[PDB]
Design an enzyme around this catalytic site. Structure first.
Site, PDB file in Angstrom:
ATOM      1  N   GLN A   1       0.874  -1.214   0.000  1.00 22.71           N
ATOM      2  CA  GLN A   1       0.000   0.000   0.000  1.00 22.71           C
ATOM      3  C   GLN A   1       0.895   1.244   0.000  1.00 22.71           C
ATOM      4  OE1 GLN A   1      -4.130   1.855   1.415  1.00 22.71           O
ATOM      5  NE2 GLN A   1      -2.023   2.560   1.649  1.00 22.71           N
ATOM      6  N   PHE A   2       0.306   2.426  -0.184  1.00 23.96           N
ATOM      7  CA  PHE A   2       1.016   3.728  -0.106  1.00 23.96           C
ATOM      8  C   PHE A   2       1.040   4.202   1.349  1.00 23.96           C
ATOM      9  CE2 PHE A   2       0.245   8.389   0.122  1.00 23.96           C
ATOM     10  CZ  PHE A   2       1.520   8.815  -0.172  1.00 23.96           C
TER      11      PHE A   2
ATOM     12  N   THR B   1      -4.698   6.075  -3.581  1.00 28.71           N
ATOM     13  CA  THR B   1      -3.597   5.082  -3.381  1.00 28.71           C
ATOM     14  C   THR B   1      -3.554   4.145  -4.599  1.00 28.71           C
ATOM     15  OG1 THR B   1      -2.636   4.692  -1.189  1.00 28.71           O
ATOM     16  CG2 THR B   1      -3.887   2.870  -2.098  1.00 28.71           C
ATOM     17  N   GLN B   2      -2.400   4.057  -5.272  1.00 29.49           N
ATOM     18  CA  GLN B   2      -2.184   3.175  -6.452  1.00 29.49           C
ATOM     19  C   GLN B   2      -0.813   2.498  -6.326  1.00 29.49           C
ATOM     20  OE1 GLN B   2      -0.776   6.088  -6.269  1.00 29.49           O
ATOM     21  NE2 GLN B   2      -1.033   7.154  -8.226  1.00 29.49           N
TER      22      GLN B   2
ATOM     23  N   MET C   1      -4.305  11.099   0.080  1.00 30.10           N
ATOM     24  CA  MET C   1      -3.995   9.646  -0.038  1.00 30.10           C
ATOM     25  C   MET C   1      -4.112   9.201  -1.503  1.00 30.10           C
ATOM     26  SD  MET C   1      -3.043   8.519   2.810  1.00 30.10           S
ATOM     27  CE  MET C   1      -3.268   6.742   2.875  1.00 30.10           C
TER      28      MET C   1
END
Lengths: 195, 222, 244, 231, 211, 240, 204, 235, 233
Positions: free
Chosen positions: B1-2, I1-2, I107
């Site tokens: 995930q980021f 988020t990617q 995000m």
């Protein structure tokens, strides 16, 4: 865990509620009253998640009191129970459901009959001679299924409730620090000091 | 995930004198085991004799310092150029930090200046805005190395008068700016030796009635 | 801009009256007369259809008498379309109450809500008020048999006997004269028809120009029946009372 | 006449009367002067009191370290427009690390005023502004009208009896433009300019308001005994 | 460790001053009592920021009440403002354990415990020993209703000392407050290091220590 | 949404919609308030143009806001219901958040606030209603009587009247009400209220309603016969 | 955890010669604990009968919802709703909560008042329609009911015969399910009479 | 009809100029600023003798260091007072100190011109905002529905304003004591009031650095009225 | 988020006496696949700024469009667009830094590491870094990805401190950058031989070199390496 019991006798409804407030391994209070007077002849006892219980009961109390002032009439217990169930039935599919279980004890002045309602946090409602919420349910139920008589008097009802609490103290593993008992009849709602 | 957070290391130290205050920090910026910059300031003049440092995630620290600098500008505009007192600045910064309570600024904030009576003041904040006024505070990676030294050498903790055998505490006293600078230099020199994220250089901002002046000292580059 | 063309439907006159409400009441005075009479043992609703034709299908026709639930009916005087908007709103409130409390809505609570909607159109929104007056005939177990009226102002009052629409002044005088408190439904039926028969602008009162309804405890034992009279049944009660 | 009910209505000769009425509010306002050299730009404002017990209404508002204006007309409308300039100056600094050009500040005031002249329900701004600033192309003076028209000038004046000061500056153009690296002399020329718009009343210590911005001079306002030097 | 109990002489409020991040001791001088108004006190337990921010906010809301109604806010009303606010943020991760203590003519001496869970309780005694909230004192043996004010102050001070010694996350100094009719009084800050040795010598307690 | 500014200033600095709202009040049936030493009485006129009325079910002129506070009004009946509903909701909202019933002054200030808001809000007209709000504060024995009007101003009154011919009954009260010695008993206070209405009413039959509010939520509405006994005694003393 | 088996209970419907039958148990529980033996699961809107199994809060909610909708229908249409039409209304109402559904197993039974044709239908929780000629089953003992019905049922049974078949189908299915029983009710439905019988059964 | 935000050919907003007329009909309010404090006085003007005068609230506390007197449609002031109190407290919450009197005034005046087709019309009430702060000491401001505010050494608003202001023009000097200022407000109120000035139909208040904002008791005001009568009879 | 799909590797840079140098290889990798060659990752903005971008290429092309749009917008009502009010390196950086921190705080980040190289109006060398977290810093030498680990050590031997910048010529600086690109080709499994180099000098302006190749490589020693220890053949 919290004990809330209800027994409906010939001419009244008696509610017994545990006086202890515990969060984890801490006891916050030993004199807590888990009851709100909805109307002069209707009483609600509640058990559940911290905060939700009082917030829900006070919210219901305010709505029933508003109806009483507006119509100068007292809503029947059947009507009050239906209103409460519907508020809970809304909350289950809400963003954060109210985790509250309630007992509603009321005297219907029109029918001159006492009524007891058991409602869970999902909005599941039934009318019963006797009811309870939580772990104390399995014991009390079977005990009452043996002793309860439809034509019992208020004094007989208190003795049976007294037996249930005594047996619960021995059998239950947590200390609920006694119960508060309230009677609902034609004359209104009173608290039994001696118990 | 980021992952939206990072650690840029560094250490900040604020000491309050009787009629002055100092805010110091190392000029080293790191990520993981790499050195990003050997000189990247972390202690800023924010106007009205206030110096501010937000140490932790560099992005969050830069953003917060900007917002406070902006906050000072709008205080002057909306309040007929009233000087912003250190206690007012501290309370304002709490509200800035608490605004992002559910997406916090990953920083340790220290501000130094003079109070309204002209005495030196240091304020320390947690990431979510809890703040308290103190004589001494160290923030950042090497805070655990420096704070005990400061307790011992600034507040004379666990020091007693010789010949009393612990009966009478060493008298508390106000340190001179020259003594305070020595402690700041010694603290950073010690922290540089034992902390991998501390080194390269030391920049100290001294605040007096006369204004804000800046001292720079080289630290070990390993 | 658009201000130029605004009638301002929610302002006071220098005399402290609401223009649009007063004008709406003028409209309703031209509508067919509706009468409600409350007896000890039930309520009667009688109303006059406005100048009909021989080619109007009467047996499938409804313009005056509408069912709100099993216990409450209304007689309409004014714009039929405007009434149907309010009737559907009332039908929904009645079912909302029943769903919430598991009891049939008391008559006054339904009346008060419909009246509060009308009031709103007079105080905000800049829209014209509803050109409708209702007679509410209802039963509940608090106050028993009840008659109410509401008008475009949103004001409502209770009645032993009342008229709305055309020739109310005349109708109210005739009712005030012949009405007694110990009166029964059969008597109240006769009074209602005799009152319309005298106040009507038509040459004669016939079955094809009337809508009739009774709310009786004349239902087997302890319950209440609504009877919307059929064309042939209105013809029979006209012969019985001796008007045709 | 029939075409002054709102700002959305043109007159048969193609005039906007609500805008022209707003323009009138300025003429009723107290006089303010603006002039610049190559190095410095000066605002001079005559403040107006209600009576002898009352204070003198502030005329000059700081917008940034390098820019500010003087107002003539509805003070609350100057507060709204100056707040908008403060924000735009602030946006330029934060996002681009760039001091907002005076010319671009003009373009932004113009476009904000315009929207209030083409839409129903709203009203034009009832104030005129003299914006001074020092940016990357040197000293600047702008005049704002609530019609939306913004003009770059060597000097000008707005408010009651402004024509007197404007004529003086038109004569002195060749002199005061050359006053480089001498702030006191440029203010003297500004005080001598506004003096041409006075009648009965003269410049007192709590009457006069002066502001200056330049090469090595932040936008600063002088009031009280700070302007006694120039009386 | 925060302690608030009720007696004849009013309300005794005693707190420690230690703040921790994991095993790290961040501060020993933290103020865990917020002076809302001359008659109202709030104790802070749980998240330092959550308690500081919302109890400071409560002081603002209490001030507005005074202005709008020309009267002191009741402890019941002040407590419920904070309890109703936290309930809105319930499940968002607010960590707050707090006791609102004041005296008013209407109610007399009153203590309300307000929780981040939305729990609001009225009681004669509340204690928060790291992570745990109790309706009883750390000792509770010495507690009788009729107690000397200066005697009651010591019990509160002694009770914080007990928890400070045993609990790793409690320590620093003891801050004492006495709440009565016509406001609260500060009874000073007592460093536990100095206090412990003195108390030991005078009381002849902590024999398991050695010194 | 309808935004039109209906309440605006006129060249002489009057708001006509607010002043025309006062005209609606003038048209309303008379309402009177009198506070004794240990009580407050609310008298109300019932216009006898409407007979064949069902008095059991017809909306009564005095409305309980809580168990200890009552509201009477003069003006548009429909408008009054909206203020009564908002007041009743605020009374329960106050009990819920403050854990105490409203003071009479607080409930008045709220209703007056609503009336004001409807004088400078777009798309709305002011309330054609003036109110008398009477009761006793929680655990207090001091009588309270307040008045509100469409503009939103409110104030406390020893005694006051509103509606049609209020100028006459105010004249009566101004000469008959002594501040140094107010009506000592319930009898004296009811008598003075019935007397004040008899100056305007017509017949003392079903045209006068009386509601007595005593301390500690003690509120009762007098019957026809009870009021008729006051009407009888007043005129028998007058024959002299 | 599984919403459709917290409270427990069953419904079964059958067709006969010029008649239909619908039957249910009376139990409501919190999983293992039995709370009430008076929880009837069959409701009627005029001459159309609806049984609902599953989460009890949804059984009550849908009963109140369909009472509401059939009341408004009757006021507007000026006639009682018919089984075929009510079936389409149940389906419609369930599928509008597609991504947040009621955890229920509804069953419709009734005789068309005009055609006299016996009609039964069942639905999944999102409102798919099962229109069987023979029988419909629902609840925690659906597997048991399918078994009993598939062997006991024959077409064109007389009312008093159909009663015995549906009664023995319910009773024997319920006794093999932990979360079903505590009494049972059977409705025998003819064109213009309906008999309701409570069955004696084991209370364990 | 015509726009609510419409300019007149003279460059004035019709609705603002009309509201100023409403304020002229209002009961008198006077403020005097001294180096010892700022005094605020009002005419109560009860419509009947049965109206309990002590319930007439035209002098109002905003914070401990800021008082407020009103004149005009006084009901309109309730939301302005509400905003002022909220602004004063909110600023104390954000900055841990007392708000400047000018900043509080500026905040109230920002509501003024928020009307159009926001609220439907301007406010029909003027405010005298008196207070103290450390920067600019004792201050008196006049807040109008135009959104404009002026600072004043002394100011009168309402029905008797232009008569009162001319009296304040002569009487005010920089050396006035608080006792002198109290008597001066009572003197000028008694001059412009219809009914005879007593402790029941007039109300005094002051703001000092030490004691903050106080509304005077009827018994206290009564003594200052008796002190005024004697000193006027002394020459 | 990617997650980043098509990616670019190291961007490297340093200051010298009269200006700044920046470089980046012409590859767009699709994981382990070296899919796109000839991808330009140095994007010039006017004649005083070059923006080097590593990370997601789709996000790079978005940023390319924001900068193209920034030049257009700056020209609008700006008579001094090609003079005193031209875009400065410092302006272009602060904008990108603002966008990067806003996108991380929603995000939904721009999955990049960016170096802005240029010379300011007063002739001052500008060199500052920003990435997907909105983290910023300046240094006499800056590098992204593998460059940070391998290029910086080599460039820091030429300019170790601020005082070394005046003593560093453009010939010495370019030599250091070209060598660092060869080291990155030896040792980065996501690098290409083909790269672009940009010099921004305060005197000679912007020089942009395309289709540069790593040359003077050492491989001959490979022939003498047999097996992993014991093998002799």
């Amino acid at each position: 865990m919290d004990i809330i019991l209800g027994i409906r006798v010939q001419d009244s409804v008696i509610l017994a509620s545990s006086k202890a407030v515990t969060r984890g391994i801490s006891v916050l209070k030993d004199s807590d009253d888990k009851t709100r007077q909805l109307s002069p002849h209707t009483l609600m006892s509640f058990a559940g998640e911290a905060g939700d219980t009082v917030q829900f009961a006070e919210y219901i109390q305010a709505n029933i009191q508003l109806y009483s002032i507006r119509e100068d009439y007292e809503l029947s217990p059947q009507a009050v129970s239906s209103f409460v169930r519907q508020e809970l039935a809304k909350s289950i599919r809400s963003r954060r459901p109210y985790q509250v279980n309630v007992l509603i004890g009321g005297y219907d002045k029109k029918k001159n009959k006492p009524e007891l309602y058991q409602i869970d946090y999902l909005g599941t409602k039934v009318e019963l001679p006797y009811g309870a919420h939580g772990y104390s349910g399995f014991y009390t139920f079977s005990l009452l299924d043996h002793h309860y008589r439809p034509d019992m008097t208020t004094e007989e009802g208190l003795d049976l409730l007294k037996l249930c609490v005594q047996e619960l103290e021995k059998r239950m593993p947590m200390d609920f620090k006694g119960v508060i008992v309230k009677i609902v009849d034609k004359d209104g709602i009173r608290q039994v000091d001696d118990f | 995930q980021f992952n939206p957070y990072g650690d840029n290391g560094g250490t900040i130290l604020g000491i309050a004198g009787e009629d002055f205050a100092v805010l110091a920090g190392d000029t080293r910026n790191i990520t993981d085991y790499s050195i990003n910059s050997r000189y990247e300031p972390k202690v800023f003049d924010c106007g009205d004799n206030i110096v501010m440092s937000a140490n932790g995630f560099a992005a969050d620290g830069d953003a917060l310092v900007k917002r406070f600098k902006n906050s000072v500008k709008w205080y002057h505009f909306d309040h007929n150029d009233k000087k912003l007192s250190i206690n007012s600045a501290a309370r304002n910064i709490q509200h800035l930090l608490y605004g992002k309570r559910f997406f916090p600024y990953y920083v340790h904030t220290i501000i130094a200046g003079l109070d309204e009576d002209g005495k030196g003041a240091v304020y320390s904040f947690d990431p979510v805005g809890s703040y308290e006024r103190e004589q001494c505070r160290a923030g950042g990676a090497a805070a655990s190395l420096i704070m005990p030294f400061l307790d011992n050498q600034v507040n004379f903790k666990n020091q007693y008068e010789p010949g009393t055998n612990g009966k009478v505490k060493k008298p508390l006293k106000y340190l001179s700016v020259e003594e305070v600078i020595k402690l700041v230099r010694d603290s950073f020199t010690s922290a540089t030796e034992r902390h991998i994220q501390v080194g390269d250089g030391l920049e100290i901002l001294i605040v007096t009635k006369d204004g804000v002046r800046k001292e720079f000292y080289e630290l070990k580059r390993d | 801009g658009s201000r130029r063309y605004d009638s301002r439907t929610t302002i006071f006159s220098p005399e402290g009256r609401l223009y649009q409400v007063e004008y709406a009441l003028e409209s309703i005075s031209h509508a067919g007369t509706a009468i409600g009479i409350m007896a000890s043992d039930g309520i009667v609703l009688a109303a006059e259809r406005k100048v009909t034709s021989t080619l109007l299908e009467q047996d499938t026709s409804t313009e005056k008498l509408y069912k709100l639930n099993d216990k409450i009916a209304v007689a309409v005087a004014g714009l039929t379309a405007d009434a149907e908007i309010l009737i559907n709103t009332a039908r929904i409130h009645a079912q909302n109450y029943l769903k919430t409390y598991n009891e049939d809505i008391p008559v006054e609570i339904l009346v008060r809500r419909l009246s509060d909607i009308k009031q709103g159109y007079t105080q905000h929104g800049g829209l014209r008020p509803f050109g409708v007056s209702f007679i509410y005939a209802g039963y509940d177990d608090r106050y028993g048999y009840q008659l109410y009226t509401s008008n475009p102002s949103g004001n409502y009052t209770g009645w032993k006997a009342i008229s709305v629409g055309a020739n109310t002044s005349a109708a109210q005088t005739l009712l005030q004269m012949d009405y007694k408190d110990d009166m029964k439904v059969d008597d109240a039926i006769e009074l209602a028809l005799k009152t319309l028969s005298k106040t009507t602008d038509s040459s004669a009162l016939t079955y094809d120009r009337l809508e009739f309804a009774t709310i009786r405890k004349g239902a087997n034992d302890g319950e209440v029946y609504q009877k919307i009279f059929k064309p042939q049944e209105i013809k029979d009660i006209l012969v019985k009372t001796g008007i045709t | 006449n029939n075409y002054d009910g709102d700002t959305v209505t043109f007159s048969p000769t193609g005039r906007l009367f609500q805008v022209e009425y707003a323009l009138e509010a300025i003429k009723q306002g107290s006089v303010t002067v603006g002039l610049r050299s190559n190095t410095h730009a000066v605002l001079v404002a005559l403040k107006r009191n209600a009576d002898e017990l009352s204070s003198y209404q502030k005329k000059i508002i700081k917008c940034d370290e390098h820019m500010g204006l003087s107002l003539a007309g509805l003070a609350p409308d100057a507060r709204v427009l100056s707040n908008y300039l403060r924000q735009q100056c602030n946006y330029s600094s934060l996002v681009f690390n760039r001091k907002l050009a005076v010319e671009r500040a003009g373009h932004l005031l113009c476009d904000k005023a315009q929207k209030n002249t083409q839409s129903y329900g709203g009203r034009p701004y009832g104030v005129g502004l003299l914006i001074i600033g020092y940016d990357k192309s040197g000293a600047h003076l702008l005049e704002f009208q609530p019609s939306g028209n913004v003009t770059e000038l060597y000097g000008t004046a707005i408010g009651a009896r402004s024509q007197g000061a404007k004529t003086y500056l038109e004569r002195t153009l060749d002199t005061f433009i050359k006053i480089d690296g001498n702030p006191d002399e440029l203010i003297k020329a500004g005080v001598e300019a506004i003096s041409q718009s006075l009648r009965d009343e003269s410049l007192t210590v709590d009457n006069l308001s002066i502001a200056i911005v330049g090469k090595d001079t932040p936008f600063t306002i002088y009031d009280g005994e700070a302007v006694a030097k120039y009386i | 460790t925060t302690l608030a109990f009720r007696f004849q002489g009013g309300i005794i409020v005693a707190v420690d001053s230690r703040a921790t991040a994991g095993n790290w001791v961040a501060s020993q001088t933290v103020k865990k009592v917020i002076e809302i108004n001359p008659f109202l006190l709030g104790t802070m337990a749980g998240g330092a920021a959550d308690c500081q921010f919302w109890e400071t906010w409560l002081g603002s809301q209490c001030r507005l009440h005074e202005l709008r109604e020309k009267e002191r806010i009741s402890v019941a009303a002040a407590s419920k403002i904070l309890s109703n606010l936290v309930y809105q943020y319930k499940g968002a991760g607010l960590s707050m354990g707090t006791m609102i203590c004041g005296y008013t003519r209407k109610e007399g001496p009153t203590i309300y415990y307000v929780d981040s869970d939305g729990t609001r309780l009225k009681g004669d005694i509340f204690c928060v020993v790291s992570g745990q909230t109790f309706a009883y004192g750390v000792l509770d043996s010495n507690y009788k209703w009729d107690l000397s004010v200066e005697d009651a102050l010591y019990l509160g001070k002694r009770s914080i000392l007990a928890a400070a010694h045993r609990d790793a996350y409690s320590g620093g100094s003891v801050n004492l407050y006495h709440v009565t009719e016509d406001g609260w009084i500060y009874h000073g800050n007592h460093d536990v290091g100095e206090l412990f040795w003195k108390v030991k010598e005078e009381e002849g307690s902590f024999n398991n220590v050695i010194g | 949404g309808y935004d039109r500014a209906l309440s605006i200033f006129s060249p002489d600095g009057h708001i006509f919609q607010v002043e025309y709202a006062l005209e609606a009040v003038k048209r309303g049936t008379c309402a009177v308030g009198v506070k004794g030493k240990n009580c407050v009485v609310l008298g109300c006129e019932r216009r006898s143009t409407l007979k064949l009325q069902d008095t059991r079910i017809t909306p009564s002129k005095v409305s309980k806001i809580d168990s200890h506070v009552v509201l009477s009004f003069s003006g548009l009946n429909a408008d009054s219901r909206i203020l009564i509903e908002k007041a009743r909701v605020e009374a329960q909202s106050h009990r819920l958040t403050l854990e105490d019933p409203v003071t009479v002054e607080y409930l008045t200030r709220y209703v007056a606030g609503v009336q004001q808001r409807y004088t400078q809000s777009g798309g709305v007209r002011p309330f054609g209603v003036s109110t008398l709000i009477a009761g006793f504060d929680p655990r207090d024995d001091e009588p309270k009587l307040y008045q509100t009007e469409p503009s939103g101003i409110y104030s406390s009154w020893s005694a006051q009247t509103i509606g049609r011919n209020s100028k006459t009954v105010r004249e009566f009260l101004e000469k008959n009400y002594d501040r140094k010695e107010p009506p000592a008993t319930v009898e004296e206070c009811v008598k003075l209220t019935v007397r004040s209405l008899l100056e305007v009413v017509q017949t003392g039959a079903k045209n006068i309603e009386i509601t007595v509010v005593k301390p500690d939520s003690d509120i009762v509405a007098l019957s026809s016969e009870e009021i008729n006994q006051y009407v009888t005694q007043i005129e028998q003393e007058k024959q002299e | 955890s599984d919403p459709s088996s917290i409270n427990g209970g069953i419904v079964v419907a059958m067709t006969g010669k010029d008649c239909v039958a619908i039957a249910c148990d009376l139990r409501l529980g919190s999983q293992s604990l039995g709370v009430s033996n008076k929880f009837e699961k069959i409701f009627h809107y005029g001459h159309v009968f609806l049984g609902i199994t599953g989460l009890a809060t949804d059984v009550t909610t849908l009963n109140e919802m369909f009472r509401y909708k059939t009341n408004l229908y009757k006021l507007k249409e000026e006639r009682a709703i018919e089984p075929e039409t009510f079936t389409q209304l149940v389906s419609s109402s369930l599928y509008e909560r597609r991504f947040g559904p009621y955890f229920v197993g509804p069953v419709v039974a009734g005789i068309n008042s005009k055609s006299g044709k016996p009609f039964i239908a069942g639905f999944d929780l999102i409102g798919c329609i099962d229109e069987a000629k023979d029988f419909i089953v629902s609840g925690t003992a659906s597997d048991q009911l399918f078994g009993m019905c598939e062997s006991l049922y024959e077409p064109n049974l007389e009312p008093e015969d159909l009663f015995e078949t549906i009664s023995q189908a319910l009773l024997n299915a319920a006794d093999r399910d932990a979360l079903s029983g505590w009494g049972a009710v059977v409705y025998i439905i003819k064109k213009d009479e309906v008999v309701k019988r409570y069955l004696k059964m084991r209370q364990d | 009809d015509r726009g609510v935000s419409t300019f007149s050919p003279e460059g004035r907003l019709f609705q603002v100029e009309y509201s100023l007329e409403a304020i002229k009909l209002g009961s008198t309010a006077i403020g005097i600023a001294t180096k010892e404090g700022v005094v605020l006085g009002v005419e109560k003007r009860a419509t009947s003798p049965l109206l309990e005068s002590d319930s007439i609230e035209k002098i109002v506390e905003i914070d401990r260091h800021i008082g407020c007197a009103m004149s005009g449609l006084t009901a309109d002031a309730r939301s302005m007072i509400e905003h002022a109190r909220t602004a004063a407290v909110t600023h104390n919450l954000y900055y841990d100190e007392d708000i400047n009197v000018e900043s509080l005034t500026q905040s109230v005046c920002d509501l003024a011109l928020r009307f159009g087709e926001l609220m439907s019309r301007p406010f029909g009430v003027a405010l005298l905002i008196a207070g103290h702060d450390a920067d600019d000491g004792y201050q008196l401001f006049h807040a109008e529905p135009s959104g404009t505010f002026y600072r004043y050494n002394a100011k009168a608003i309402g029905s008797g304003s232009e008569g009162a202001q001319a009296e304040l023009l002569n009487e005010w000097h920089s050396s006035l004591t608080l006792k002198e200022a109290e008597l001066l407000v009572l003197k000028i109120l008694k001059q412009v009031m219809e009914e005879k000035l007593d402790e029941n139909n007039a109300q005094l208040s002051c703001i000092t650095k030490q004691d903050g904002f106080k509304i005077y008791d009827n018994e206290k005001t009564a003594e200052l009225i008796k002190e005024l009568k004697e000193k006027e009879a002394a020459e | 988020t990617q997650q980043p799909i098509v990616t670019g590797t190291s961007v490297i840079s340093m200051k010298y006496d009269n200006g700044v140098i920046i470089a980046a290889d012409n590859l767009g990798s699709y994981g382990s696949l070296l899919r796109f060659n000839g991808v330009e990752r140095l994007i010039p903005v006017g004649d005083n700024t070059v923006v080097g971008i590593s990370g997601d290429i789709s996000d790079m092309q978005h940023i390319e469009r924001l900068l193209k749009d920034l030049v257009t917008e700056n020209a609008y009502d700006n008579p001094l667009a090609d003079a005193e009010e031209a875009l400065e390196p410092s302006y272009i950086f602060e904008y990108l830094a603002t966008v990067m921190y806003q996108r991380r705080s929603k995000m939904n980040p721009l999955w990049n590491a960016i170096i802005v190289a240029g010379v300011q109006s007063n002739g001052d060398q500008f060199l500052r870094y920003v990435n997907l977290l909105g983290v910023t810093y300046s240094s006499p030498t800056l590098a992204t990805g593998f460059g940070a680990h391998m290029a910086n050590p080599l460039l820091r031997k030429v300019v170790d401190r601020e005082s070394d910048i005046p003593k560093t010529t453009v010939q010495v600086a370019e030599e250091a950058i070209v060598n660092a690109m060869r080291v990155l080709y030896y040792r980065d499994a996501r690098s290409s031989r083909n790269f672009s180099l940009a010099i921004i000098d305060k005197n000679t302006g912007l020089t942009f070199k395309k289709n540069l190749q790593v040359e003077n490589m050492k491989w001959d020693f490979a022939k003498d390496i047999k097996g992993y220890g014991t093998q002799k053949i």
